[PDB]
Symmetry: C3
Subunit: 445 residues, 3 copies
Amino acid sequence: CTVGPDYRTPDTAAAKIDATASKPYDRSRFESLWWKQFDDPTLNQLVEQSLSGNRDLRVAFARLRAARALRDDVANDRFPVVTSRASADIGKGQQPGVTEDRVNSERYDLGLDSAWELDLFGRIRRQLESSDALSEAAEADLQQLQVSLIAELVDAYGQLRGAQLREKIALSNLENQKESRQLTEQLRDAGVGAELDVLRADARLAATAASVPQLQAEAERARHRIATLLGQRPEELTVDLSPRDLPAITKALPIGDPGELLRRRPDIRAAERRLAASTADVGVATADLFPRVSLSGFLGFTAGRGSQIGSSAARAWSVGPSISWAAFDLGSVRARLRGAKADADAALASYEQQVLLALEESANAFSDYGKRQERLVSLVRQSEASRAAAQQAAIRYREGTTDFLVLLDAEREQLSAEDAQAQAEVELYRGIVAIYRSLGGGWQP
Amino acid sequence: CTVGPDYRTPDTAAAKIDATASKPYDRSRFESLWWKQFDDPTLNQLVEQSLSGNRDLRVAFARLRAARALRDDVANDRFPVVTSRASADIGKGQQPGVTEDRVNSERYDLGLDSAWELDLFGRIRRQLESSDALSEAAEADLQQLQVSLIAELVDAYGQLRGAQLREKIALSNLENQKESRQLTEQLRDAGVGAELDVLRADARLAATAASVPQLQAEAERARHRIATLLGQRPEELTVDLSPRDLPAITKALPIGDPGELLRRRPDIRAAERRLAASTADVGVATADLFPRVSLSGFLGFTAGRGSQIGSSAARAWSVGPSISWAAFDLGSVRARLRGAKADADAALASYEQQVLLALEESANAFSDYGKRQERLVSLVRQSEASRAAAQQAAIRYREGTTDFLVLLDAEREQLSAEDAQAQAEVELYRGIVAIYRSLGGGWQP
Amino acid sequence: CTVGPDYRTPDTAAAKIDATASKPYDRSRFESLWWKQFDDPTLNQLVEQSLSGNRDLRVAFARLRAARALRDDVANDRFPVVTSRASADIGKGQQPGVTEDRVNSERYDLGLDSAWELDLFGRIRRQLESSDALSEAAEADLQQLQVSLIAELVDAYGQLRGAQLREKIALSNLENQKESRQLTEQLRDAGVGAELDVLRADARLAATAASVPQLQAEAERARHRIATLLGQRPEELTVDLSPRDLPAITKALPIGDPGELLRRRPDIRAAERRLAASTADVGVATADLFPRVSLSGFLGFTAGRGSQIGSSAARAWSVGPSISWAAFDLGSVRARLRGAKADADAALASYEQQVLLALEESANAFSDYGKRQERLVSLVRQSEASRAAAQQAAIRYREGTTDFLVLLDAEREQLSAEDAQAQAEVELYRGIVAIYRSLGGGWQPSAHHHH
Ligand SMILES: CCCCCCCCO[C@@H]1O[C@H](CO)[C@@H](O)[C@H](O)[C@H]1O
Ligand SMILES: CCCCCCCCO[C@@H]1O[C@H](CO)[C@@H](O)[C@H](O)[C@H]1O
Ligand SMILES: CCCCCCCCO[C@@H]1O[C@H](CO)[C@@H](O)[C@H](O)[C@H]1O
Ligand SMILES: [Cl-]
Ligand code: NA
């Protein structure tokens, strides 16, 4: 008898994402070490350091150890608990029933105490089933944290490279705008120009120069996130983060069969294990509806005179079988069973919410990424056309055939176009991170 | 007797919102089913389905069931607790007081055990007062969750419509700009234009084209959000969410008396019930300064020989009145009572914080909504003037009385004004959501 | 004897912020009342009201009271627990090993019951040590809340002044825009202008006018945050928030020595205290490897007849010494010890995480502050050049020597540059707030002899 419900994993349908039978994706294989596809040795080294150094990941390993330990304690309860004891009871007073004289009472005991719950309705088995499930939930929390940390770290490296790239674009445009300002001064100083042109050229220059330390500020915050993610102090970063291009993936993304994502994601597995544990805890409570059968025991020495402890004349053994049942207090037991039942329903609903959220995340990740590819195509044209316009406009302002606002406006748009394209490239990179995060890549899978 | 403080609900003054005596608002009625004023049957359907499907709401129902179960367990402690038992003590050794010969010894017992706490100072009455209040707190948490879920979902629908409206504005402006690009080519080719016009028109068209998939991406995210809020997978959502106009409310908003808002909001009642519970708990702890009167009992059979259990010559009864009092351990009792007073002071301050947060949310929503109405008036005027500007610039550019930049800039401003007016209409719809969430609209009794 | 590990504070190296040996910072002093340097008596009153009224600070202080009361209860376990009792056992049945007759049975007891765990391996001393350290983690949680709340309140005052500043600038740019609209109309009606000029000037006015109620909305939301942070209802604010300038500190920033920052941060002390409690808890579990020794007792009266209770004839006493040891259940004691040790690893690891997060907030605050100063320099220039361009473009438009677009564009850049400058001024103010928050400003570390 192991009473209560026997847990079965819910019959959860595979994820279905149609968007993935398309050019951008390769369903034939899944890459577990998904970040290496960027081909960036600096990134690969950040990730390896993270996995040895991160303090959140280290808390999660410790919690996994703690959970195993809880389990190990509970598993002993299937066996008699045999402890040691030496005690005495000594006093003087009446002894009602026997005498109204005040007489000396002495008693000495030395030996083994035994306590055993016979697990006839599986109360104890259910407890262990529960702790086993909680131990596996802790393993899966640890794996999720790994998935989460790697995505966060790869993502922050993206933001660093982005700030760097945008800084480079700001300073490149700042030189075009300085050339323009210098031309407005030259034409003004040769008597064929205007202060108005110079003032507008100064203002635009100053706007562009203002963007530079803001972008450097962002890059620094990203260096500092990266250091914390690595388990390192900000000034102690080992890995060199001097600018390099934003990484890129050429090939179609190896995403495997999107219908395996719910099986691969550890957060799903962790919530499924919590549901398993909770379901076993209904069994624990269900056992209290039935009688409890216990078996106490003593083996050693009992004596009225302390001097005899240890001798054959004081040998003693005792056995204490006991059956308890709640009887008229079954109402209380039923209340606790309803408690355990409500908690298992909370756990199932919570499991289902995790599934739903996981499907929401992957549906977003794939929807975003398709759309971000399309957007980038339009941004690349915008940048090419902008540049060509700003070049033509600079020529014509020099030659006297267009007003300064034509060159100013064309310069503003070139900056705006180039910067927007960079941001869109960063988004694509981060969209890749989001896809692999939502698929549960990076724990070993 | 019932020791400790008698709980009284704090005398919290009514919310006062002076800005509600304006024209935007109707204080003569409150609509509970506040979203139905949008007259959007698709919205109505979404809300009804989320009330049966949402999984966070299912979790809260189950938490309520858990709390009622704790309360039911406590309620039985008012009465003698009567369990059943069959035990035996079997052994061989000395029997101190009686003999030093190692003898066989047997005791059998079978019957009913009684444990009764007389509760003369109302310790148990107070325990039940606390558990009852907490069941009510769990019921209020459930209702605050409905309020928050319905606001979240109405708001997401708004965002979905917003992105659909903005995609529509972007595509409409994309056509105007495509007509402009074709005009620059045509005039260039006919010999009265310039490559510099065409390049610039190419860049702006691409910029507008680029916005379209970003808007579409956002529409897809809001759709996936709605699906999870309904308790559905993204691909199972059957509700037809193809574009419709952003809903609007043309009559003054029925907001009722804003002095009722603190009584309506379930968050406030949940924090009030937690306060009532912690106050009962002070009662529990205060009761331990006084003696505890109890009464134990046995009714059944007691025998020296297993043979006799069940027979008349083994009938036994037993009664154990007991009075205990902490005496020199009152330091420990006083320490717990201080603990309980501190907890009740936390719960009081936390209730006041919730009140002040509710008034803040409420003050923001009204202040926001008034300003978003005024702001929209100016944006409507901006959009009108801009369309007329763009219209005229296009006539003037075709005719040869203005330069391409004038037309380019007027089209930029048209898009920018139109898009901004759209975002402001979306803000207004969300302003209405914020108002009703802040008044505690939309929960079931 | 006290068993298990003896806690030593980690040897945590000092923070090193190279960037702070610079002209913007004065490392010779630290002001713990860091907001007073803005020399803004309105702000100073907000802060004092907040400290009297804020409800979250009351919650945290009440949690600290409860933690100390818990610690006081655990402290009593080092001594005999002596309770009092009056009782009886009355019945009818057999009495095994005595008679098989159903006899009447009566018994009365009255006196003191005593229970004592003799704390020979320090189980109870370690419990008290854990519970004291958790007390301390609660004083420090409260102190970290106060640092956070002060920073949040000062930051919100800044946003409020920001929003008032930007509304002033929008309104001022609106007046220039209206003068320009008037001119497009005159030039039109005098046969030397264009309807297209009037139309674009109207679109621009409406755009600028649109921004005003949004800035007012922002300012209202800041007033309302301020009120909740003071423990006040939104319409009952006691401090007048009518527009004033965003405060400034011209003096170089008194930041002390950056290698003192980890000692000044209460969030660090809290996490360190939880690590100390958790290490004590290893001790608690270690003590269960060893025997437990107890002494029970009774002193009072025992009798078979009720009337005799209280008299000499019925005096009574007993003593009940005891020693147990887990023996064959040692594997359980060991599982719990492995568990306690795992929890201590977890705590050391959170303590270190908190240190790293504290160094990241500090690095970011100093980094941002420096960059924000540089940026403001360029934005001040933008504003100066834009204002002058717009003045000139107006002269030129009036002359018949530009399309209106030259003026319209110069007026947008003037508003856009001034507004950006005001935003950057707000961001510098908020950067100051982020520096002080990261350094653990806003509480008194020297109080209570530190510990
Ligand atoms: C009237 C005299 C009776 C004589 C009885 C002798 C009791 C011996 O006494 C016992 O001796 C043992 C070693 O032999 C010890 O281990 C015991 O602890 C001790 O109490
Ligand atoms: C077991 C014998 C019964 C002893 C009962 C003594 C009754 C105690 O009496 C109570 O003691 C408290 C002292 O802290 C006070 O707060 C109460 O006001 C007082 O009435
Ligand atoms: C660990 C021993 C606990 C001592 C109780 C101290 C009670 C008050 O604690 C004080 O609260 C203030 C805010 O209310 C903080 O500014 C102080 O730094 C803090 O010590
Ligand atoms: Cl982190
Ligand atoms: Na009960």
